[PDB]
Design an enzyme around this catalytic site. Sequence first.
Site, PDB file in Angstrom:
ATOM      1  N   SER A   6       0.840  -1.191   0.000  1.00  0.00           N
ATOM      2  CA  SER A   6       0.000   0.000   0.000  1.00  0.00           C
ATOM      3  C   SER A   6       0.878   1.246   0.000  1.00  0.00           C
ATOM      4  O   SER A   6       1.764   1.373   0.844  1.00  0.00           O
ATOM      5  CB  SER A   6      -0.907  -0.006   1.231  1.00  0.00           C
ATOM      6  OG  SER A   6      -1.485   1.269   1.438  1.00  0.00           O
ATOM      7  N   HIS A  31      -0.765  -1.372  -4.518  1.00  0.00           N
ATOM      8  CA  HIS A  31      -2.093  -1.251  -3.918  1.00  0.00           C
ATOM      9  C   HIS A  31      -2.385   0.218  -3.625  1.00  0.00           C
ATOM     10  O   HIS A  31      -1.608   0.895  -2.951  1.00  0.00           O
ATOM     11  CB  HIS A  31      -2.194  -2.080  -2.635  1.00  0.00           C
ATOM     12  CG  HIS A  31      -3.571  -2.097  -2.045  1.00  0.00           C
ATOM     13  ND1 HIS A  31      -4.567  -2.934  -2.504  1.00  0.00           N
ATOM     14  CD2 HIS A  31      -4.126  -1.350  -1.064  1.00  0.00           C
ATOM     15  CE1 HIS A  31      -5.671  -2.722  -1.811  1.00  0.00           C
ATOM     16  NE2 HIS A  31      -5.431  -1.762  -0.937  1.00  0.00           N
ATOM     17  N   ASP A  33      -4.986   2.938  -2.243  1.00  0.00           N
ATOM     18  CA  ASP A  33      -6.135   3.166  -1.363  1.00  0.00           C
ATOM     19  C   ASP A  33      -6.748   4.541  -1.601  1.00  0.00           C
ATOM     20  O   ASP A  33      -6.093   5.575  -1.390  1.00  0.00           O
ATOM     21  CB  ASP A  33      -5.718   3.028   0.098  1.00  0.00           C
ATOM     22  CG  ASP A  33      -5.449   1.605   0.465  1.00  0.00           C
ATOM     23  OD1 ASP A  33      -6.408   0.803   0.408  1.00  0.00           O
ATOM     24  OD2 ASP A  33      -4.274   1.272   0.709  1.00  0.00           O
ATOM     25  N   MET A  35      -9.656   7.232  -0.774  1.00  0.00           N
ATOM     26  CA  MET A  35     -10.608   7.615   0.270  1.00  0.00           C
ATOM     27  C   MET A  35     -11.191   8.975  -0.078  1.00  0.00           C
ATOM     28  O   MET A  35     -10.444   9.889  -0.438  1.00  0.00           O
ATOM     29  CB  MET A  35      -9.919   7.658   1.650  1.00  0.00           C
ATOM     30  CG  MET A  35      -9.203   6.350   2.011  1.00  0.00           C
ATOM     31  SD  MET A  35      -8.446   6.451   3.652  1.00  0.00           S
ATOM     32  CE  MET A  35      -7.528   4.906   3.745  1.00  0.00           C
ATOM     33  N   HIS A  65      -8.302   0.238  -4.504  1.00  0.00           N
ATOM     34  CA  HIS A  65      -9.305  -0.076  -3.491  1.00  0.00           C
ATOM     35  C   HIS A  65     -10.097   1.202  -3.226  1.00  0.00           C
ATOM     36  O   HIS A  65      -9.559   2.169  -2.669  1.00  0.00           O
ATOM     37  CB  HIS A  65      -8.616  -0.605  -2.226  1.00  0.00           C
ATOM     38  CG  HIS A  65      -9.516  -0.713  -1.027  1.00  0.00           C
ATOM     39  ND1 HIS A  65      -9.022  -0.898   0.248  1.00  0.00           N
ATOM     40  CD2 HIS A  65     -10.861  -0.641  -0.896  1.00  0.00           C
ATOM     41  CE1 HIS A  65     -10.018  -0.934   1.112  1.00  0.00           C
ATOM     42  NE2 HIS A  65     -11.146  -0.778   0.445  1.00  0.00           N
ATOM     43  N   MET A  67     -12.410   3.232  -1.209  1.00  0.00           N
ATOM     44  CA  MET A  67     -13.143   3.569   0.011  1.00  0.00           C
ATOM     45  C   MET A  67     -13.876   4.889  -0.209  1.00  0.00           C
ATOM     46  O   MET A  67     -13.555   5.923   0.363  1.00  0.00           O
ATOM     47  CB  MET A  67     -12.184   3.642   1.203  1.00  0.00           C
ATOM     48  CG  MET A  67     -11.730   2.264   1.612  1.00  0.00           C
ATOM     49  SD  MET A  67     -10.202   2.301   2.565  1.00  0.00           S
ATOM     50  CE  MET A  67      -9.085   2.606   1.204  1.00  0.00           C
ATOM     51  N   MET A 136     -10.866  -6.810   4.985  1.00  0.00           N
ATOM     52  CA  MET A 136     -10.200  -5.817   5.818  1.00  0.00           C
ATOM     53  C   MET A 136      -9.954  -6.410   7.196  1.00  0.00           C
ATOM     54  O   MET A 136     -10.881  -6.909   7.837  1.00  0.00           O
ATOM     55  CB  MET A 136     -11.059  -4.549   5.936  1.00  0.00           C
ATOM     56  CG  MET A 136     -11.247  -3.779   4.608  1.00  0.00           C
ATOM     57  SD  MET A 136      -9.676  -3.321   3.882  1.00  0.00           S
ATOM     58  CE  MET A 136      -8.922  -2.336   5.165  1.00  0.00           C
ATOM     59  N   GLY A 141      -9.559   3.446   6.836  1.00  0.00           N
ATOM     60  CA  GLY A 141      -9.574   4.878   7.002  1.00  0.00           C
ATOM     61  C   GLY A 141      -9.331   5.367   8.408  1.00  0.00           C
ATOM     62  O   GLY A 141      -9.376   6.581   8.633  1.00  0.00           O
ATOM     63  N   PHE A 142      -9.089   4.476   9.372  1.00  0.00           N
ATOM     64  CA  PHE A 142      -8.860   4.912  10.745  1.00  0.00           C
ATOM     65  C   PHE A 142      -7.406   4.750  11.185  1.00  0.00           C
ATOM     66  O   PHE A 142      -7.116   4.879  12.374  1.00  0.00           O
ATOM     67  CB  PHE A 142      -9.816   4.183  11.698  1.00  0.00           C
ATOM     68  CG  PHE A 142     -11.269   4.514  11.446  1.00  0.00           C
ATOM     69  CD1 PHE A 142     -11.996   3.806  10.493  1.00  0.00           C
ATOM     70  CD2 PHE A 142     -11.889   5.552  12.133  1.00  0.00           C
ATOM     71  CE1 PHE A 142     -13.331   4.118  10.216  1.00  0.00           C
ATOM     72  CE2 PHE A 142     -13.220   5.878  11.878  1.00  0.00           C
ATOM     73  CZ  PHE A 142     -13.944   5.154  10.921  1.00  0.00           C
ATOM     74  N   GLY A 144      -3.183   3.467  11.454  1.00  0.00           N
ATOM     75  CA  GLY A 144      -2.399   2.307  11.843  1.00  0.00           C
ATOM     76  C   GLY A 144      -3.061   1.554  12.983  1.00  0.00           C
ATOM     77  O   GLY A 144      -3.265   2.117  14.072  1.00  0.00           O
ATOM     78  N   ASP A 174      -5.903  -7.039   3.970  1.00  0.00           N
ATOM     79  CA  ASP A 174      -5.307  -5.718   4.165  1.00  0.00           C
ATOM     80  C   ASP A 174      -5.555  -5.259   5.589  1.00  0.00           C
ATOM     81  O   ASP A 174      -6.713  -5.150   6.007  1.00  0.00           O
ATOM     82  CB  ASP A 174      -5.882  -4.690   3.195  1.00  0.00           C
ATOM     83  CG  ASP A 174      -5.196  -3.314   3.327  1.00  0.00           C
ATOM     84  OD1 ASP A 174      -4.128  -3.219   3.977  1.00  0.00           O
ATOM     85  OD2 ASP A 174      -5.735  -2.338   2.788  1.00  0.00           O
ATOM     86  N   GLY A 175      -4.475  -4.958   6.309  1.00  0.00           N
ATOM     87  CA  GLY A 175      -4.618  -4.367   7.624  1.00  0.00           C
ATOM     88  C   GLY A 175      -3.745  -5.021   8.672  1.00  0.00           C
ATOM     89  O   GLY A 175      -4.043  -6.126   9.140  1.00  0.00           O
ATOM     90  N   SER A 197       2.955   0.037   6.181  1.00  0.00           N
ATOM     91  CA  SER A 197       4.021   0.485   7.065  1.00  0.00           C
ATOM     92  C   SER A 197       5.093  -0.581   7.246  1.00  0.00           C
ATOM     93  O   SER A 197       6.273  -0.244   7.365  1.00  0.00           O
ATOM     94  CB  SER A 197       3.442   0.901   8.423  1.00  0.00           C
ATOM     95  OG  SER A 197       2.602  -0.109   8.953  1.00  0.00           O
TER      96      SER A 197
HETATM   97 CL   LIG Z   1      -5.773   5.910   6.905  1.00  0.00          CL
HETATM   98 ZN   LIG Z   2      -6.815  -0.977   0.617  1.00  0.00          ZN
END
Ligand SMILES: [Cl-]
Ligand SMILES: [Zn+2]
Lengths: 221, 221, 221
Positions: A6, A31, A33, A35, A65, A67, A136, A141-142, A144, A174-175, A197
Amino acid sequence: CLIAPSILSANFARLGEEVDNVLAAGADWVHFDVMDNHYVPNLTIGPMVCQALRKHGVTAPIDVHLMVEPVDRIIPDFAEAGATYISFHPEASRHVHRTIQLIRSLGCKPGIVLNPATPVDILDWVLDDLDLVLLMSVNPGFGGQAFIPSALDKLKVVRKMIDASGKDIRLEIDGGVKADNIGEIAAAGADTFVAGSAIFNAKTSYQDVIAQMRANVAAAR
Amino acid sequence: CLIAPSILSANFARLGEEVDNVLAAGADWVHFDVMDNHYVPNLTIGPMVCQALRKHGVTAPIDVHLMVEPVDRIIPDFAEAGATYISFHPEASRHVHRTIQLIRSLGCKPGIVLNPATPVDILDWVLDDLDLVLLMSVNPGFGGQAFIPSALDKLKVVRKMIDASGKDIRLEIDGGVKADNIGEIAAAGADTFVAGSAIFNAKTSYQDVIAQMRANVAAAR
Amino acid sequence: CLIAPSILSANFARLGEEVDNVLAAGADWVHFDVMDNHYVPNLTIGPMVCQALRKHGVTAPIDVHLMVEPVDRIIPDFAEAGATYISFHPEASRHVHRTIQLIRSLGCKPGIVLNPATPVDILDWVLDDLDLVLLMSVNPGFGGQAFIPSALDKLKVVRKMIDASGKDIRLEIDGGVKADNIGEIAAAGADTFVAGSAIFNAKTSYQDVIAQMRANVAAAR
Ligand SMILES: [Cl-]
Ligand SMILES: [Zn+2]
Ligand SMILES: [Cl-]
Ligand SMILES: [Cl-]
Ligand SMILES: [Cl-]
Ligand SMILES: [Cl-]
Ligand SMILES: [Cl-]
Ligand SMILES: [Cl-]
Ligand SMILES: [Cl-]
Ligand SMILES: [Cl-]
Ligand SMILES: [Mg+2]
Ligand SMILES: [Zn+2]
Ligand SMILES: [Zn+2]
């Protein structure tokens, strides 16, 4: 199987360098993301950034992806910008089957994303039309967060559904994916791994982290 | 007076290089157009990109134009990311005075943006609280467009209002600004000039275009 | 002229007692701030609380300030619950003239509320249909705040408009009104005074604060 870093965690002042280097280091996909500040409480990057990577010479699959909510208007812009996969949240579309058809009609590979609480029966009538399912394992969106353990159990359920379909459908996660849990996640059924990360902020190189991840996945299967 | 190139037209694969070079070439500010796919039909770049430019070493003012609705939640994220000015559309906030106060409370310089049709009387009760007024001379979020001629008449009206206030308030213009019309735009009252494709997609260098713009502005005053 | 304490600042565990006591202390109206968590970021009290005051025996005018959006559905519920005045924000209704007519058709007295930034020309075509105009001197729904000085200038403008109409229209003020500024506010043109914390959270009795407020208003006229 497939490593899809990501880029939210990369240096956006040198995004082309970061993507070039992470793909050279062993990543398969980029990837991406997206938002829109409405579906989740953050705003990231839109089609112009995808187009910029294509113009820079990136030829690897770009895995977008969404969101965002609603989803249909922006999908043609990502297709035009060179997206390879486009995934979205069924809750964000009033006509999930049409949104899948739209993605495919543009030459892109459609995916469905399940939030941690989303029941799997939203796949009941569309699974055969999908190229990808993303689970997920954090709340999107919230920020780390730690891997949500129930995603391991949900991966096993969706793996059985994909296997029963007989179709070639990627099972993406993812996550909070990192070197020390990617083995267990692979054993649970994922074959496409999003990490942010853990790759871009590692104390060792991108290539070392990705190599360890692959080794850990291979040892767990 | 001030040149504020819009980075929407820059190479996002090498954004740090582009910004470094355009500032070296004579630009004063980095103009940062933020679109959330709702207030306008496009999605651009969020706070993380602003933060990345600061981490890259950019110290010039970053001028954040919010084409988003609602506006209050994302404003602290842009303040923390290092925004200098934050402007927004009054139609996009239910409590315009509070949104201005919020921007100011975070140490940022608040601006109000008037769309081409927006009457100027929305400035009646907030003008003294602003550091910037931006007039759109294209419809925001609908792409590369031609300068809307009525913007010249509205610049003259808002210049009179700012002059009568006695306050130090920038009068900014954005949309279809190029070397061959910037003189007339300056004569109408603008002192802060946003240009995108005219700078980043020019057939001559960034430094040549910016020097011509400055010469054209000086000759018109 | 008229004192309208805002019960948001009262002890809601003993609301009937609080309202009885503040009216016995010299208040004229019960001011009722209704927030729906959408038009402003807070949720307060609905029609059932108005009905409870009527059932408790309150016969003074109940002045309902709707900080809700949309507004039409809940207006008949407040009329049925015994509201006397119903005021609303024109930005929150798609058909401001109809909303006024609806309030009037239910036997209630309609008012329009101007937020600090709201230009006065929204009164141009409805002023003669109103019984009340309310000027906000704080941002509604954002808590205990200081009086916004520009409200004094806007009161003078709206006072002239009401006087030119020849109609009997209350000019109400709400936000940071206290004993030591109510004289100046009355001089600016307000004749209906909403105060919350200054009455219900005062260090002196309700009867003393209200008497001081009245004396200060009389001395300023
Ligand atoms: Cl985020
Ligand atoms: Zn994603
Ligand atoms: Cl379709
Ligand atoms: Cl969830
Ligand atoms: Cl604030
Ligand atoms: Cl417009
Ligand atoms: Cl655009
Ligand atoms: Cl009606
Ligand atoms: Cl306001
Ligand atoms: Cl409040
Ligand atoms: Mg179900
Ligand atoms: Zn802009
Ligand atoms: Zn009120």
